[PDB]
């Protein structure tokens with residue numbers, strides 16, 4: 105649109121005449137100039153508005169400098185869905201019968217623009233179109249939703265704090281951000297407190313049952329039941345799940361941006377089982393996408409997913425989900441593009457009344473450090489094909505040097521990706537503790553040493569992050585692979601220590617003739633095998649992990665001699 109307004113139609117005649125554009129444009133027409141929206145809107149007709157001026161309105165309220173037609177379509181579709189929920193609620197009639205809820209609808213549209221800023225506004229030289237992430241989940245995500253079945257709403261992701269001029273402003277939790285001055289009138293605030301709206305709630309100090317009730321209301325689930333409670337449900341995860349649900353229930357394609365460390369599959373499975381509750385039908389459908397996947401199997405799997413989608417919907421009245429993990433490593437990433445962006449599989453249209461939501465993932469596009477590139481090229485014999493002559497690149501850089509071998513994400517997906525988070529390590533250690541308490545089975549193993557195990561796991565993870573390069577971003581993937589290693593080492597830690605003492609007695613002096621913990625030595629083995637085995641700067645790791653170790657192995661020499669002794673034992 106930005107490059108047609110000057111020289112000149114532009115809008116689709118059948119789409120302007122559609123409600124998905126007429127309703128947002130009608131509301132924007134009434135709101136651009138200042139009129140009370142108490143009048144009855146959405147006549148189920150076509151207003152005397154022009155497609156050109158409609159495009160002008162959506163441009164001046166889209167904010168981003170150079171929007172494609174896809175981004176305008178996303179904005180308008182999202183805004184239409186949200187205003188449809190607003191009209192479906194009895195709050196317009198609530199204001200009519202209250203006669204003092206004035207200023208409610210201007211706040212409604214302003215907050216709509218805010219959450220649209222959230223949703224339909226994203227944004228090395230060749231990685232610049234991809235790695236340049238202006239907004240992360242470490243940003244304000246003000247969210248409001250209208251719960252269909254009942255008459256209670258949910259205001260998540262922000263706070264309402266009394267302003268100095270008598271008003272109430274949007275203050276984000278855990279810090280001070282004073283965005284959106286003068287958004288509402290105090291009569292709306294009074295009517296809201298008359299309506300007992302759950303506004304300005306810090307969800308970090310609310311019970312699991314109550315937060316699940318808040319979700320089920322927000323997720324529109326009636327008679328909620330709690331399917332899983334072994335996963336911590338923080339505020340940011342709530343923001344993510346509501347973001348996904350809004351995205352795929354309004355119509356926006358939902359591509360997921362994040363690294364392997366972040367928990368994405370777990371969260372979507374959580375959402376799917378919350379939607380399902382107790383039916384035995386297969387709702388979530390994981391698809392493992394990898395660097396040998398060709399379009400035939402993706403097309404076939406999507407077809408079978410839509411088949412099982414009819415199966416679920418027609419005779420269960422349920423909504424299912426199909427998921428793709430790291431759906432970027434395939435040379436057929438664009439196949440995922442036509443699957444999800446324009447709703448067409450292998451040239452065949454995907455039915456909106458079938459009942460199915462497609463969610464795909466993506467890896468972050470970032471080049472390795474030159475230090476580990478030297479490490480790789482020096483791994484004995486160098487690579488067969490050098491970088492200048494590698495055919496499978498994305499730009500001027502081979503996939504061999506990237507942190508994930510990921511091909512160029514096609515356009516019309518860049519305006520769609522949105523990051524889940526970097527796993528800031530504030531909740532990393534808690535998840536590690538949960539894993540090490542769930543899968544170690546330490547009912548009677550070590551009442552307090554489990555804290556030490558989790559802490560040294562987090563310390564090693566921080567060592568991995570506190571270094572310019574990493575193997576493959578094995579964050580929260582090597583820990584859930586090494587808890588099992590630790591459990592195995594403890595399970596056989598009985599004859600191992602006996603053989604250790606025998607070997608050290610029959611082949612060494614009295615220095616290695618001391619008792620060792622069945623756990624701490626097992627911890628030394630787990631760190632030696634999962635983490636200390638791979639990296640080539642082992643001295644630094646030995647000196648930077650000896651801190652979290654207790655008295656027997658306070659230094660690097662102790663850890664090294666223990667690992668070497670066990671290798672010699674085997």
Ligand SMILES: Nc1ncnc2c1ncn2[C@@H]1O[C@H](COP(=O)(O)OP(=O)(O)OP(=O)(O)O)[C@@H](O)[C@H]1O
Nearest residue numbers: 113114115116119173174177441445446515516517
């Ligand atoms: N002039 C227009 N007026 C209204 N909507 C438009 C206009 N042009 C495009 N759109 C909207 O843009 C959306 C995306 O466009 P479309 O799928 O044709 O993109 P594309 O350029 O073919 O995609 P890609 O290059 O990613 O394959 C369509 O669903 C359509 O509704």
